[PDB]
């Protein structure tokens, strides 16, 4: 539908992704592309029980602080995260498309250091991805995600606004936290593809990067960012709630 310097939007990327996947590990994540297990069949709850469900910690006061620091160890399987800022990534660590979010899903391909597109399936050593994460009002995308060649997901995005207390009572919301801030909106504090703590911006490979959301249902949403309009479909679960915020 359209192509550009990086944004191969319109849902049509051609071959410029980096097809460097390794099968030495027997986890067989690549073989898990055809089918997805049930929620309670893959041992999700043990991995999903490490983060506080609804009310994590309360106020953090009015000032919207930015202390991105570094979030580098835990996997981004639940909406808790403090993703760091990534500008470039060697193309020897990517296995599949790198979907990035305007928030509307967008694909970024392999490019030369100087920016010349290269057509080598990312096999070449010099291949590198250039993605300087910047907010939509200043251009580029919030942040985005891919799969590392060993079989583990990755995330990256702009600084997340900081909020917390004193009794080990810190909540660093990377998205939403509507009631816990003076009107924190995804257009400001949004970092990754987590629109709200129980929603996702669905894309063709969503079930592959976050296979603990297989039970999620579909929805069609309309969002305004900056001074433009976005039509999007987001996947939110029907976990007991009132979805009219």
């Amino acid at each position, epitope marked *: 539908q359209r192509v550009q310097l990086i944004n191969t939007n319109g*849902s*049509w*990327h*051609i*071959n410029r*992704t980096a*097809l460097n*996947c390794n099968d030495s590990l027997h986890t*067989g994540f*690549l*073989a*898990a*592309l*055809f*089918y*997805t*297990h*049930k929620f*309670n*069949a893959s041992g999700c709850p043990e991995r999903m029980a490490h983060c506080r469900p609804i009310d994590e910690f309360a106020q953090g006061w009015g000032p919207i602080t930015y202390a991105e620091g570094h979030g580098s160890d835990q996997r981004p399987y639940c909406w808790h995260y403090a993703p760091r800022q990534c500008g470039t990534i060697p193309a020897s660590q990517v296995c*599949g*498309p790198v979907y990035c979010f305007t928030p509307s899903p967008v694909v970024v391909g392999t490019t030369d250091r100087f920016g010349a597109p290269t057509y080598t399936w990312g096999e070449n050593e010099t291949d590198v991805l250039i993605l300087n994460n910047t907010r939509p009002p200043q251009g580029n995308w919030f942040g985005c995600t891919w799969m590392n060649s060993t079989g583990f997901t990755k995330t990256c995005g702009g600084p997340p606004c900081n909020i917390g207390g004193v009794g080990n009572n810190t909540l660093t919301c990377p998205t939403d936290c509507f009631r816990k801030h003076p009107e924190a909106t995804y257009t400001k504090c949004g970092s990754g593809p987590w629109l709200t703590p129980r929603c996702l911006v669905d894309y*063709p*490979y969503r*079930l*592959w990067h976050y296979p603990c959301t297989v039970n999620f249902t579909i929805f069609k949403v309309r969002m305004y960012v900056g001074g433009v309009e976005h039509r999007l479909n987001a996947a939110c679960n029907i976990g007991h709630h009132h979805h009219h915020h």
Partner: antibody
Amino acid sequence: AEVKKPGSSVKVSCEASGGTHSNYVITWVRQAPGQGLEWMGGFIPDFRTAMYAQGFQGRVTITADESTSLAYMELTNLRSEDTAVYYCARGPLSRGYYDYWGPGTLVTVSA
Amino acid sequence: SYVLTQPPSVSVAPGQTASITCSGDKLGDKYVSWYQQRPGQSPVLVLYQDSKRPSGIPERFSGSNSGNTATLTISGTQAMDEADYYCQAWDSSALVFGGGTKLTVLR
């Protein structure tokens, strides 16, 4: 139809992506007369990597040509039991249910 | 090896309800899908993911899955619903197709 000589090879072709986003995973299924269905392998247009079933590991080979936007499977060394109807399904990317079963192809061998 | 079993054949009278069961080992944790194959025709999808039904299939078809059995219940059967029915599941990175069940409506 024409009966294939034993020890020969056969090809089954399925429409494949021309080198862009596909959003479907291809598979091949066979049905011997009144014997149910069986699986052979898969193929993901985005990831050239193929997947082969345990039964037919040593005789199947899945490859595709993006220029012609066609993907085919080659089966070699046919025997009497390899007489059946060859289907070609196309299911969603990661839901694992096969929909839009295309027309079948019949191949016969003479013992 | 993983193997699925279903009754060889089921006979039902018009207007009644017929039950077809797909049985395995701890099948309750799999995502089954049912295929209807008429004589000499390509199979078509009739149920995917236990109970979700695609567009174009009448409301008569229904399904359920629990324990070690998956059920395909048909209510108000008529002469048009005579065909082979197959059960599907995924396991150990390999596809398994259950033994075909033949449904015949007595006249």
